Structures are given as C-alpha cells and as structure tokens.
Predict the structure.
Amino acid sequence: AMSLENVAFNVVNKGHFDGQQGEVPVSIINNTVYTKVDGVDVELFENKTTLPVNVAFELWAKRNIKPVPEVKILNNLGVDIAANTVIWDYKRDAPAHISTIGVCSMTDIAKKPTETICAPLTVFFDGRVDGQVDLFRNARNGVLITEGSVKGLQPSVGPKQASLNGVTLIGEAVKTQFNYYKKVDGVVQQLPETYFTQSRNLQEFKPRSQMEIDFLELAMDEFIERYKLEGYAFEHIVYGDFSHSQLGGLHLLIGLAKRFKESPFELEDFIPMDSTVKNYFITDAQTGSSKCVCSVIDLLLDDFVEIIKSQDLSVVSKVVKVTIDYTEISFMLWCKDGHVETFYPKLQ
Amino acid sequence: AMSLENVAFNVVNKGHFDGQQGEVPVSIINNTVYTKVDGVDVELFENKTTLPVNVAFELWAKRNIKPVPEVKILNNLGVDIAANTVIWDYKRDAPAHISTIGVCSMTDIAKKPTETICAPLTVFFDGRVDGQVDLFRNARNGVLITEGSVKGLQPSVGPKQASLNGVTLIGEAVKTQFNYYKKVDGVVQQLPETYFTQSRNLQEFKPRSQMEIDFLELAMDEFIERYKLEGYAFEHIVYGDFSHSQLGGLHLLIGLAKRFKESPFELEDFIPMDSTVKNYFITDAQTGSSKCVCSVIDLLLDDFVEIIKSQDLSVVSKVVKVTIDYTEISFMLWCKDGHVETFYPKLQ
Amino acid sequence: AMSLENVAFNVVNKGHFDGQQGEVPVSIINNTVYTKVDGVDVELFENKTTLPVNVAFELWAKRNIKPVPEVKILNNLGVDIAANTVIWDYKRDAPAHISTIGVCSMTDIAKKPTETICAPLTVFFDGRVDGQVDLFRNARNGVLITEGSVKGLQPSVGPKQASLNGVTLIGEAVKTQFNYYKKVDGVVQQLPETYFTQSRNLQEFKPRSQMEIDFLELAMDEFIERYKLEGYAFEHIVYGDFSHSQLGGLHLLIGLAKRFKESPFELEDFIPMDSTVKNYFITDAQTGSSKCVCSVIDLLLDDFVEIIKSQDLSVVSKVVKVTIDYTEISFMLWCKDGHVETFYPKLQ
Amino acid sequence: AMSLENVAFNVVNKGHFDGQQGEVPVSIINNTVYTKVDGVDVELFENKTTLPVNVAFELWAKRNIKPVPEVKILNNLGVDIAANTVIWDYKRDAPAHISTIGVCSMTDIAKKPTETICAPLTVFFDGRVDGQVDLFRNARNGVLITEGSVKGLQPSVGPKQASLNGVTLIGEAVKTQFNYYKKVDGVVQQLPETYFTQSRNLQEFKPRSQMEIDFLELAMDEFIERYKLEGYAFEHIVYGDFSHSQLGGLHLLIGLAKRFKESPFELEDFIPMDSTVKNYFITDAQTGSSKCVCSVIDLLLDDFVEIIKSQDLSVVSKVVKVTIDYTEISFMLWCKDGHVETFYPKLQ
Amino acid sequence: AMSLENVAFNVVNKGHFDGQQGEVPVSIINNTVYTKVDGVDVELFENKTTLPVNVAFELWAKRNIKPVPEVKILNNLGVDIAANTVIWDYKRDAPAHISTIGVCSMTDIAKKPTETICAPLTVFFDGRVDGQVDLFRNARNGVLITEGSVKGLQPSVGPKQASLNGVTLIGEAVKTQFNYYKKVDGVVQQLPETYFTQSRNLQEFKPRSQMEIDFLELAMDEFIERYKLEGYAFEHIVYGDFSHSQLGGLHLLIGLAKRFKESPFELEDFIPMDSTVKNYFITDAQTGSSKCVCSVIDLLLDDFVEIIKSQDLSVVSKVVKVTIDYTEISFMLWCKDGHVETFYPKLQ
Ligand SMILES: Fc1ccc(CNCc2ccccc2)cc1
Ligand SMILES: Fc1ccc(CNCc2ccccc2)cc1
Ligand SMILES: Fc1ccc(CNCc2ccccc2)cc1
Ligand SMILES: Fc1ccc(CNCc2ccccc2)cc1
Ligand SMILES: Fc1ccc(CNCc2ccccc2)cc1
C-alpha cells in the first residue's frame, strides 16, 4: 500500500522509508516535495534527478542506508540495475539506476529479479539480504557482494571502503570490504587482479602509508632522493608544472592535495559523477596556469610507484594498461633517453 | 486513508473520487498528473489553478458532481467556503473556494463546519446532504440550498438553472431550481426580490419567451413596432450600432446572439470568471467596429423590457440599481427629451 | 550526424525529419522548441510527453508519416516497441513507446531489432519497409503488418482503417487494411477470430451499413420493429435512458451520434488514450442525466446485433467475453424472464 | 509611473492598457498572470512568448487596438521595430518585434525613434498618430502607413484588409486600406507593383469576384471551359489530385476551400506565423492522400489566372518570380509540349 | 556546423567548446543540460541566466578561457558587446553581454564587428587575437586591450589583475595587465588617470603594501599614530563603529577583513554583480549593529590615504569626485572643525 503521503510520513518520522504506516499532508510545487507542519510548508526533498518529482522522492526515501559499493566500482563491473533496493548516487543526487526491481511501481521493470525482463541486465545482488545469494545463482547476468564466503564461488576481495549514506569510509563499526562475484550469460566470470583508488577528498586528504606521509612533509628534491625516484618524472606527473600557461601534469590526487595547502586552485568537475579517473578543468590561482582536461586518479602513492616502477622506459610513446577498480585504465607513458617524461591516465 | 495514488485510482476507475480503495502508479511532471497504463504515461489532470498540482488534482477529483448553484449566484450571496464538498469553478478551471471543510488535508481549515474557525465565514450548505440543513441552523454565517421546504424558514426561489459538471442546464431528469436561505451573524436574512440571468451561450442560444422568439425572427423595425418599444433605445442597447469605429451598445446577450447568426465577431473575455455582468473586448469581423469593455448581461428580454419601462426618463444621466442574481447591479440610464439614449450595466 | 538544430531544420523545410542536412537556430524555453525566423522566435513543438523537450521533439519529428495500425490494435496485440520507426500516439500527444530501435540516441535501446536486448520485447515490424519481414522471422517476439502475402505464414486480415498522421481513415489513395502476424517466444501464433471497432467520431459519424442508415433515420419503435429486436434492450443499451438522474445505457457510439444531433452532451474523456472500449463521464445538457463511467464501444451495429443475438438469455448476470480488435473484451449481460435488461462493456 | 499592478488594473477595468491610474493585486505563477477578484485568483494572461511573463503581459496590454498592417506585410517591407506602439502578432501569440520604442522599460531600446540607436532599424510609423509622419521624414530607415496623402511623397496603395485585434477584415466602420511609404538609408523608396493575398480562412471562405463565385459553384470541367483555362493545369494546381499516396498540387486556398465543403482534411501548420505563402503538412481524410510540405497562397483567382496566363510555357522548368505583398515570391513553373504541368509557390 | 550535441561533446571531452567534431546524447529538462553517460543522465550545465537553456549552455561553453578584463572595468568603460568571444560574468553566472558577434546563431547580431548593426555599440576587441586591433581602428565605438604597444595609439595602463576563468589574479605564468584604448563615434577618446580597486575577498584577504600589513597587525590607536592619520576619521570610516543599532562606516574592505577575523558578520550582497563600489546589507553577529546599504570599496590603503590626505577639510558636506577603475566615483566628505567625520562612497 504505497503512496506519496506514506513515503513522506516515513521520511518525517523515520528519516527514510522504513515501511511504517501513516500519512502526512504533501504538496508538490514544481520539483520540491513539501509537507504541512503546523500550517507551514516545510521542504522535504528537492528533485535534482531527470525523473518525476514524486518518483525521485520515493526512490530517494527507499535508498540503501547500509554500506554499499561505490558507484565507480558497480559501473566498472557493468551493473545496470539493483535487486530489491535503490543504490543512490550521492555524487549525482539521483538513483545510480533509472529502473528498479521491487522498489517503486513507477520505475519497476519487475517485482523479482527472477522475471525474464531482468535476464539481459547485470542485476546487483546484496549477499547480506536473505535469498540474494540464491538469486545471483539463478540470474543470467549479475554482480554479488557478500560479507563472507559463498560455497563454491571464487571470490574477489574488493576495496576496503564502501559508501555509507554518501560518506565513503573504511568500516570500524560496520563491514565495508566485500567479496565480489560476477556472472555473464549464466557463467560465473573471473574478476581480474586489481588495484583500488582510495576515494579521498582534495580538502580532506589524509595519507595512508609512510610514503604518503613523507610526500606531504618532505620537499620535492628530498622525497625523490629518499624513495630513489630519479628519472621517473614525479616533478611533472605528481607535483605539477605551473610555470607555463598550460598546467603540466598533476595526475595523482596526493600531488593536488600537497599543492592545495600552499596555493588554492579551481577544480572544475565538468562531469559530476563517480569515476576511477576524474577529469577537471583546473585553474591555479597563484600562477594562472590552466588545463582544460586534467585527468586525476587517487591511487595509494605506493601503488602508483609500483606501477611506474614496473614499466619499460625505452619507447617514445606507448599505452600502458593497468587494472584499477576492476576496469582497465589505459595510461599514456612518454619516455626520452631511458627516463620518463609523463605518465597520465590517457583520455578517451 | 487519503493518498495521491488512491485519488488517481478513483479518477481512473470511477471518473472522479468515489471513496474506493486501491492505488495506480502516478507521476508528477510540472503541473500535470500522469498515470502508468500498460507501460505508457497517460495524462489524468493538468493544473490550471494557483494551488500545488497534487492538491488541485484531489480537489478536482472531489468536486461536486450533482447540480449545484452557479458560481455567480454563490459569489452574489457572499459565500466563502463550501461545507464538506468542493464546488468546482469550471469557468476558472479551479475550485470556487481555496479552503475546504472536510475535503482535503492540505486545504482543510476544519473537519466540520461547526468548528470556531468557520464562524466568520459564510459557509455553503447543501440541503440534499443529510444533516446539512441542521448545520445551517447552527452556523453563524451561511447559505443553504434545499429541494423542498425547511421548517419555519422562509425560502427564496432561486434560478431555474444549476450547473451540472460545468454544463449549466434546467433539470428534466434532476432538480436544478433550489430554495435559498441566508444567515448573517446568526440571523436568518430575508433575501431580496431578484431577477435572474438566463446563463445562455452566444453560439447555443435558445429563446425562452414569445418576445425572444419574435426578437430573433422579426426585423428591428417590426419588433420595436409590435412590442411598442419606440423611444426606449433598443436599436442601440440590444441590437447594436456597428456604423462607427466604436461599437455602440450591444449590452443584452439576445442581441449578440441575433448578430452572431449574420456576422461573426470576437468576444475577448479578458476576465475569465462567472459573473452576473460579463465584460468583453468585442471586435466585429464584418464592419470592424470595436469596444474595449462591452458589458453584457443575459436577462430574459421580457425582464429587460420590464426594467427599462419601470424607469423615470427625465434625467440626463442617473444610476439605476437593479437586483439581479441576488446582487445589486448598477446600470447607467442616459435620457434626452423624455426618450432613452442608452441603458448599459454600469462600468464600475 | 544527429542534432537538435538539424531535426529543427528538417521540421522547418520538410514538415518532419526527412534526413536532410542543415541547421536552423533553436531555443528551448521550458517545454517549447522555438526557431528564429527573420529575428522572431516561432514555435515549432510543445512537449506534452513525459520525455525531455528535445528528446520528444526528435521522436515527434521522426514519427511514422505512413498509414500505421491504430494504437488500440498495437496495444491489443501486446506490442512494446517499434522497429526502426516512431509510432506516434496522437490521442496522447506522445510516442506510443518510450524506447526506440534505431531512431534517437537518447531513447534507443538498440540500433537493430536483432540485438539481444529486444529478444523479450514484442517488436512491431512494418512489412512495407525493406527487410522488415525477414527481421520478423528472426525475432523471438513480434507483430508484423504487410500489404500482401508472406511466404508460408498464415495471415490475419486486420481493420479496414489505419491512422495516417492522426487521421484515422479507410484508404482510397493508400492501403490501410493490413495482414497481421504475431510471434511469441519464437513461435508464429494463430491470431483469434475478431470483430473490429469502426473508430468513428461522435461529431463526424457516418453509417457503414443499411442497418446503421436505418438506425439514424427511423424512430426507436420503427427500427426495433423492422430489425425484430424486441426483448434485446436496445432502448436502454443503444438509444439511452435519460429519464432518471443517472444516464441509462448508451454503450454504442451509433446511439451517442443519433442523440448528438438532437441534444448536445458533455463527454469527459477522463483517460485520454486509444482503447477498444472508451470510458466517459457523460452529462446530458437537455435532461441533466449523468454517468460517471459510461463505457462506449464503436462496433458496426450489425456486429453488435450479431453478438447480442448469439447469447443465452436465461442467466440473471453473466460475463460475455467477445474478441474485439484482437483483445478479449468482457461484457456484462443482465437478463430477466428470457429478455435482456442491459449488455454493457464490463467496467473491470 | 509604470508597474505590474497598474498594467493589470488597466487590463481588468479597460480591456487593455489605457494609461489609467490604479492597482489590483497580481500573482505570478510560472507563465500566468493572475489577479485576486473577491478572494479568488482569476487568470489575466498566459505567456506564450519567449519574453519574461510580466514583460510579455505589459507588451500585450500595450498592443495596438486600431486596424494595423498584417504582420506578413510588415515583414515583407523589412520592418524591425514599431514606433511608440506594440504590433501584436496574434498568429504567434507574441509581439511582432522583441524590442520597443517608448512602450516598456524592459524592452525599450529608445524613448523616441529619433535616437541614434534606431538609425539602422526600419522603424514602422503610423500616420494616424500625431507627429508620426514627421518622424518618418526624419528617420533614416522606416515604413509609414497613412489614411490620406502625404505632401510630396508618392504613395503605394496597400491591401484592402488590415488586422483589427487579430481579426483580419476590410473596414466598413474603420479604414483598413493604407498608403505605404518606405525609406532606406534616408532615401524615399519607390515601392514595387504588387499583388495582394486576400487573407481568408479555409473554414470562413467567401468569394471576392465572379470568377471565384463560379469556381465554387460550377464543376471542374464546366469552370475550366467557361474561363478557357485548358492546358493551364488548374485540375492539379487549384483543384488538387488526391488519387495517389502523395497529394498533387492544391496550392491555391480557393481550391482548398472548395475541397473542404466536400471532404474534411488536416492542415498541419508546422511553422505557425504569418506569411505570404503558408506551408502545411496536409492529410486528406477521405482518400488518405498526403503532402509533407504543401505550399498554399490565397491570391484572388483572377490574379492567379492573370499570373499563369502571363507566362512563357516553352521551358521544362523555370523560376517565375511574382511580387506579392511587396515581397518577391518565387514560383516553380513546369511545362510540357506548350502546356502547364504545375505552378507552385517554390519550396526554397 | 553548430549543434547542441556538438557543444555538449566539446564540453565533455574538452572542458569547454574547442571546435572539435562529434556529438554526445543530450537531454534538456527544464533549465539543466544533461548528457547520457553509460545509461545515466549526468548534469553538464545549470542555466542561471535569463536566456534559453541551450543558448546559455553554448555561450558558457564558448566563454573566454584567457585572462580577460574584469566585468567592472569593461562596464566602467561602457562596453555593450564583445567581438568574436563571450566574456562570461562569473559573479552573475551569465554572459556579460546578452548579444554576441560571431559566437552563437541565436545571440548573434552580426558575424563580424564590421557590420553596420555594431556601429552604435561599444564593441570590446582583444588585441591578443589576430586582426582585432585592425577591427578596433575600423569600428566607430569600442574598447581595445593589448599586451604591447599599438603604433600611434596612446595607451592607458590597466589593472595588474585580470579574471582567468572567474579567478581574479595578477599573472605570473600569463599576462594580466593590459593596455586599454577607447573610441567614441570614430574618435580615439583619451582614458583618464585612474586608481584601481584590488579585487580582494573578505575571507581570503592578503595585504599588498607595508601600510596594509601594519593595519591588520597593529591596533587602531598605534596604526593611526604610526601613519599620522589623526583627525581623518579612520576609526569610523575604515575600522567601523558597532556601538549603536546602526553600523557606523566600514567603507574600506581592509577594515572589513580586519573585523572578520575577530567577529563574523553577514554581508548581504543584495545586487550580485561586479562593481567598483559594492553595497551590502551588513549585520554584525557580535554586537547586533546593522546597515541596510553599506557601500564598500577595495582600494589599496595607501591609495585611500593619498585620496583622503589630498582633500580640503573646511566644508561641512561636499562631494569629492575620484577616478577609480576609469569611472568617476563620487564620495561624500563630511567635516567638522578641520577634521573629517566620514568619507564614504556616496550612494546613487
Ligand atoms: F546499482 C547500480 C549501480 C550503477 C548503475 C549504472 N551503471 C551503468 C553501467 C552499465 C554498464 C556498464 C557501465 C556502467 C546502475 C545500478
Ligand atoms: F462555493 C463557493 C462559491 C464561491 C466562492 C467564492 N466567493 C468569493 C466571494 C466572497 C465574498 C463576496 C463575494 C465573493 C467560494 C465557494
Ligand atoms: F508501436 C507501439 C504501439 C503500442 C505500444 C505500447 N503498448 C503497450 C502495451 C504492452 C503490452 C500490452 C499492452 C500494451 C508501443 C509501441
Ligand atoms: F511591427 C513589426 C512587424 C514585423 C516585425 C518583424 N519583422 C522581422 C523582419 C525583419 C527584416 C526582414 C524581414 C522580417 C517587427 C515589428
Ligand atoms: F564584454 C562585456 C562586458 C560588459 C558588458 C555590459 N556592460 C553594460 C554597460 C553598457 C554601458 C555602460 C555601462 C555598462 C557587455 C559585454
């Protein structure tokens, strides 16, 4: 017995849709959902999605309030829909999927993922929910996350971090590291050996290794000397080159964070969404150096060092493919006389 | 247990809100209420009101589908709100009243007209509903319509016509003529002696007396001779004067209807609402004569002749107040040498 | 090379999208698509769909401008999507299907109906287009219309009428009667024996048989005597019963059209869409008789007489299922002492 | 002292902006301007323009309520702006010009047409307004309409018809035929010899010559014999050819009007604006014949016969340029063995 | 070959419109431009302008991504339009000019600034673009910025700072100080000797002279003693007077910045735009002192000291006109017994 007034009642008294019974007066004026509280209209939800206001309101209310995989991971693993839940994309203020399975009468393509309409879709199953592991086994295409082992199925250990209500974190009171499983056309497909991005903020950056603690504390010349990174172009790639009108390098987020405490800069996120490699139109406020498309990845500095110090440096220009967050991130490695010149996450 | 989906279910399966149980998927895109019918969004309601889309949707669904007094009569009798119903203003595509009594949680000022909030409002009571006559007796201010006689109360016989779902008609299968009662500050008022407008369409005009049958059939000179209307300016007032750049007269709808069969014309209803006297920016397509504000009343021709012959014709210009549809309509009577020049419903 | 400006160029110079090259300046203000014509913004399209303005603009521009099956027939045959065309629903001012195959990059689920995403959808194939008959043979689910005979396949002769640009007509200069074929899970289905609705307007009604010519010309008592329809309740079912406050019967459009010449009435199409049985909130302007849900079907009078005389009249109330426009329409047959009382298209 | 509330006061009490003083409460909800009338919001204006709601409201209120040249004539004469008035385009529900001279503070480029900003614009001057003829003399570019003769200036007699409040008419109580004058770069131009379109409706068509009276009354074979039009392709050009799937000809509105009495048809005005030649996506309801772009001109039949008989019929295909409504209209004349095949207003 | 999809393709792959070829799917829902990225709609632009969504999208995409003069400077110099570029007003989230020259088909008044329509407009020319200096020479009215000297033309050295992508900065890797030239009616007009505002933030304030370093470090009494500013009312003008219910003075931004580190305050920018003198409705959170219109200018403290210590202090109240950012900023100087009382940027 689903209604706009019942969804709004749950939002008011529970913080989200909890399945409780009751109704509150609701008014819809344009893209905002209001509720009458003692004679005054109070704002409950503002629709920033491409879905009707009341439909988006309900999907937001029915969002998954448990630690869930980050949207970048589920996209990298080809997820089209989520089974009996709404994975909310907080980076886009909209559902990660536009169609649902057993969530909202307006977006539901099916009530159960067993329906033949779901067959060609990679459905996401949450093993922490009863019967979801069995549904993964019966579905043609899908992705499964589990807290433990699923008998017979070879797991892929995922990232330490999951997104809890938009807050990406490594769980202390909750489990955020999941075992991942994928199926394509009924066959369990083996997930590749992968690196993971650390999902850190530029303004809230914290080092997660001694190399990262040393990068932010030590100066450019002594860090490169301490970690033997001579001839690997860290001065351009990680640190940046703001001397000319076009910003040079600055492809690792640790280098951007080190730069941010000295000089502020405008990172224009021209495609606001979650991805393994993010692109920004950067403008440096101190020098006036700028780059229209500055591809930035947040790898653990040790992992970027392991990738860069595992490449052949004798080719003028070659594509270096690396598996990060399950997807193959192609990099452009440029060399000269046995030393690196640049190594950026190649733009496609 | 009121909801958007339940109101929409009733609209789909019953034509209006009938109190039935059930829900249909609803989507709100801007000011339109849609419903999913076999995978396609079908339009259910387009909000032309100043109220939120879903609030207006519900009040429209909960509209009174019985013959009710025309909004002009209800305004003339100073009604503010309706008791336990929604009088829908089809001429404005909105409720006749913005606040309700026991209809919608969003517009309800009270659940029962007995509440002290209703005390200063002239509440409309429908005698055909059980207990509404008793509520009129207990209310401080109000208007009551009844099909029969009320104990002790002296009635006022209203118009022959009522509005059934926007279609104004004189009932054959239903009763449309009501007894009217009014109360101001607890005191049963004596309603005035009044004329009634006939509420006819220009394109669907039908004569309702031998004088009206003769007006439309006979020529100007013959009709005025037959009914001895010489010196009463019917040639200007009723028939019209399209010889100059400014349209002369044409204040009675019977003369507009006679004119409409011969030559078409543009009536610009610049204030779309129901009123005893309607104003139109008229442009005659044949001659090119026009009038910015052409006040038109639809009186029975016999009633207009009775009013015009009941006047003193010795004043150059005087205001002639006539009680029509219970309200006092001011007319401007202009005379010259004992004869009328014009008699129009005063632009005030 | 698809763009908003190119679609708009085609609309301006060709009347619809014809694949021509060129661009015109376009401006989008809210839900309207405008074009600059000599310095003035001219309206090109107003979006009445649930899709983004520019997406709907393109699908409308790319609509099928050839006689196509009526949306009621296509729904009745369970069609989900059209192959390499846009069937435009003129009764809803929106595409008949929200997803396309090889039409618009925004709505396209696939470029060709052979893609595995189309497999569970009943794709509509137009035999008049090269290679569409072969695609029907290869598709798992689908509906096929052809002007001629298909090798091996047993046809179903459809309605005489098709919809050409929203104008339903029986072709004289074009062919509008199609052979229909259906496939479910790869198996060519045997379509049922069906009656067809005549798709006539209330205001533009024309008789299509001597019985219909006699119905509109003769009086109630004479027609029923001439065609020996005594005891079949035609006086209530077809003609109508406007004597009481609730309109009795009036389920056949021929009786509504006969009534319309004498007295006008308000048909409130509360679910604006194309269907075999249409429901209307009717209000008769002469009597004041009304019905919230008045189910109306436009069968050829001969076909309704053949259906009503092919029934057992000994049950107080039974459901009579009739295959009309390929779908099973349930009727409610009410009898008393061997005679009919009512026979309406069941409100279910 | 201009305000939204004062414009709205004038609209309510005068039908349009008359310069009167006073204010009424106004509320703006989205694109509609409402006014509070006795506690209920009444709609005053719905913005169908590309301008802000209140700006468009004011320009509409300040529209020219005198017979003015039709927007097709004003465009043909290359007018950009009107001097101290608003020419309202009723075919587009918007001002004919987006910028004003002494009308609205929001759209005003200048308070007087003498300002140097107006210098490169062809300003329209209405001779019926005091001082407008003198302003035409002083302006660099402009168009002037007058009821009488202007000293020294050689006139161009315009169309018999002008547009009075959207109603195109030939004045009986007003003058609608104007003398036209044009100036380009300070030089009084000699306007060309021109034909005029008759600006008639398809549904409200009236013949304006004996040839037009004979066209609508006589049959195709009789009319062509009476007026000796053998070999001029009137059977295709004027009458139409609905035998094939593509509608043949039908370029003259008199032939469309003759056709309309017999069979109805859908004229899709895909570019809603006023022009000398109008294009329509036509669909004939009887035959099912259709044409994506059917160019239609309303010339007096005598003028079309004078044009078609004034041509050389020995070229397979040539462009025939005709001055109509002051603009050069290109026609495509197709001949074969000394006879016409088609002569349509060229799709360019 | 300009299109919405091509502009959106450039925004996605280049950060701005770079002239590249290609298209991405675009959807417009209300005032937001979305793009389909792997089946999910990602937001690309939200229209905060008074222009149509797609028109504003294109002008924003085509914005000048080089250091350009600040909008306050170009307004002060009377600029109406920019030649073959879009100067984007980041303080208003809209183009600095509503009409373009060779940028967008919808906003273009001309393709080249040489067109006679541009003649009365002060067109902005960027000398850094090939042929723009020659176009300035040929234009009737205009403003020209150059990095070097233009033979014969007497330059005006502009501000040290220019706006690079909304970030106002003094160039280190780019040149931000330009030579300015102006022409009025074909004549090169001599630019006045002017002071420049420093364009600093209240929250991000940095001193740019020893006097400013001393103002923020030293207390009120020792700064005024060190710089001999006794009897010049710096205690009221620069520092502020929060003792009464109406805030006293606080007209220099350096004084506001000094105050901000001690006590926070609400600066209500009631006219959000770039100007030499900014007005704010200030409310001091600590004391509760407030001023409806508090005019604030950011002059270098040395320049304000040079202006105040160059005035005659014997008049009770006089207007002191000073040229700042090329425009004459009139100040109100109030004196008493040879000492200043107040000196604020006079409100007009
Ligand atoms: F839970 C969900 C998480 C993410 C999504 C959207 N992923 C779209 C995609 C599909 C195929 C390949 C790459 C991306 C949908 C639901
Ligand atoms: F049923 C209804 C019918 C009419 C109304 C609105 N009447 C407004 C009014 C109030 C006082 C004097 C004049 C007009 C409200 C409900
Ligand atoms: F051409 C088209 C015509 C019609 C449609 C929509 N039919 C929806 C439907 C699906 C299943 C059963 C009943 C109705 C889609 C495309
Ligand atoms: F009164 C008016 C009537 C018409 C207009 C608009 N005419 C636009 C145009 C300009 C140049 C050539 C062709 C068309 C503006 C005001
Ligand atoms: F690049 C541009 C920068 C600024 C503008 C807007 N300046 C408007 C103005 C005009 C006259 C005097 C004062 C202000 C337009 C384009």
Observations:
- Residues 66-191 of chain E form one domain.
- Chains E and B do not touch (no CB pair under 8 Å).
